[model samples]
Target chain A: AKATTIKDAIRIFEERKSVVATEAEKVELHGMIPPIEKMDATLSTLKACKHLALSTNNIEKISSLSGMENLRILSLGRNLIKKIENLDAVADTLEELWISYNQIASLSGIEKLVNLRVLYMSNNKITNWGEIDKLAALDKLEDLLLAGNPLYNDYKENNATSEYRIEVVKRLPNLKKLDGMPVDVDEREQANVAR
Target chain B: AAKPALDAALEALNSIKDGDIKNLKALKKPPQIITRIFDCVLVLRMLPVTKAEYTDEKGRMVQVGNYPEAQKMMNQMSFLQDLKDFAKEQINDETVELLEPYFMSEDFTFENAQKASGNVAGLCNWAESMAKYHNVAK
Candidate 1:
């Protein structure tokens, strides 16, 4: 169960099994086997890709995507990635991202996705509220899903039950929802001041 | 066990478009059995056709994936038509835009149906909304 070969990718393109969309700016290599460890040459042919979902693939790092300038929605959830690096390339055009179910513990690489709108990073090892504050840079980011992290348990216990939503909403004034529930008007109102 | 099953369902739901019709045939299953699998996948959470999360037209940030045993619980509620209708109701452009990527490959290749009803989660959300709104199911 090593990485999928570039040979695997080329054949998929030739057979049209994997989507190497040109006009659509989309490429979906979901669960394409042996876990592509590197961007390698798999997506090198798909230059115009805007929407890319490499979910459930065994990719470890997030390199080989700077050239994809038009990339909008990138989903790399369910991988073995332990760090979040090499995303400054798509920081300009990136909007929606899904990096859930990984071993990610920091929000380091994500600080620059200024246009990010929707991000789902659930089921990771996030435990720091200080890391959560880094998301305030993304003013347009409204839908943030941080479920299944130890941070929730830590804050819920320390802050005394679920009131952590107020602190999150306070820092991210643009957030419309936390975990999954809509940010209630009263909750927003209370968070606005209580913080 | 459920995680692997759920991931398998997502793979099958997203993959298996036109090219795999022959692949399915290789399994030697009848058309009825195939149809039945598709029909019942949502209820079983085997397909996650309702494990949805999306932004509504009102930008309300509607989500059902957060519920406890959310995918498993969907089966108890039998309201396919309602969910289908709910999918139809959210036919604005923005949600449609969010769906095209998921449709880049798969069963809709000939149809390229991702142009409109693309996002699988969108389909799931609206369908689950229908279930959530139904009388007996609610």
Candidate 2:
């Protein structure tokens, strides 16, 4: 059903919360009018639903969602969030955090999110890898997307795919893939042996 | 209220005369005074100050305005400025110069200025506290 206003979506979610027995599977509210400005209200709504995806929406702040306990698979692609703070609340429950095409400069706060698995942070203005060491704390993280980011263009070390991939693998021992590229240390060792 | 916290902070600062303790202890008090000063000033009846306009050396126009948050910081700075002026009046030349670095600086950014002002308040608070506490002890 089409939502004429954000109030309608909230009403629907509230009604569903009362009646629905099984866990709310998916709640897609992408590109709704008047942008999600209030972190408190947005996160309150997010806490009720599971598998929340909101792509192509004009969301600036995510600090309020730091308190959302059950938020998993948050798709905040194409937003204007610059800084990461106050996410210590949902550090355990957050499995996937999609922050693609945002102006994120550092990854200091995300280090606290121990349960983060897939982190999409492509096409942003992040330049330095100073905070990369912090990501080693995300022990369960497997996939990390960093394509179309300024960090790749600016950092000379990240320019080489093999070296860059190895660096990420070295830093994040649990990282299996980066930017959809597989990192195979055993294969590289064997190739060196053949040479 | 602000005086006691400042005094406590200053005593902590004065305890460190020969080592890193002075800087570490001295740095801790300003943030407290700043917190108090902001609360006091936000409720007073005052005309809003016009945002500072400046032309950089490159002739680029920069409009530096104070929002609610920044205004609170500016209020704290103003309080510190008064305290510094008073400290210069009462304290000896050496003490005045020692306190001068807390206020006298060319860097005027919101962050640096707020911090500097907080340091001054902390020192003033400490001095007053020390005077009272010493008399009581005697």
Candidate 2, residue A4: the lDDT equals 25
Q: For model 1, what is the error of residue B94's alpha carbon versus the real structure, in angstroms, after optimal superposition?
A: 16
Report the backbone clash tally of model 2: 4
Question: Per-residue lDDT tens digits of candidate 2, residues A16-130?
Answer: 4563312455554443333343345444544455556454344566755543557777766555678777777777788887766567888878887788888877666667666
**What residue runs in model 1 are displaced by over 4 Å at the alpha carbon?**
A13-20, A154-161, B1-138
| Alpha carbon deviation, residue A133, candidate 1 (Å) | 0.8
State the iRMSD of every prediction, in order shown.
10.4, 23.0
Q: Best lDDT goes to which candidate?
A: 1
lDDT of 1 by residue, A1-195 (tens): 346654574455446644435544656565454545667644555668887767655677787775676888888776677887877878888898887667788887677888998887766788988888889888789888776677876765576535778878878877986665678888888877876
Q: Which residue pairs of candidate 1 clash?
A: A25-A50, B17-B106, B17-B107, B83-B127, B99-B119
DockQ of 2: 0.01
Candidate 2 residue B50 Cα shift, in angstroms, is 34
DockQ of 1: 0.04
The Cα error of candidate 1 at residue A47, in Å, is 2.2
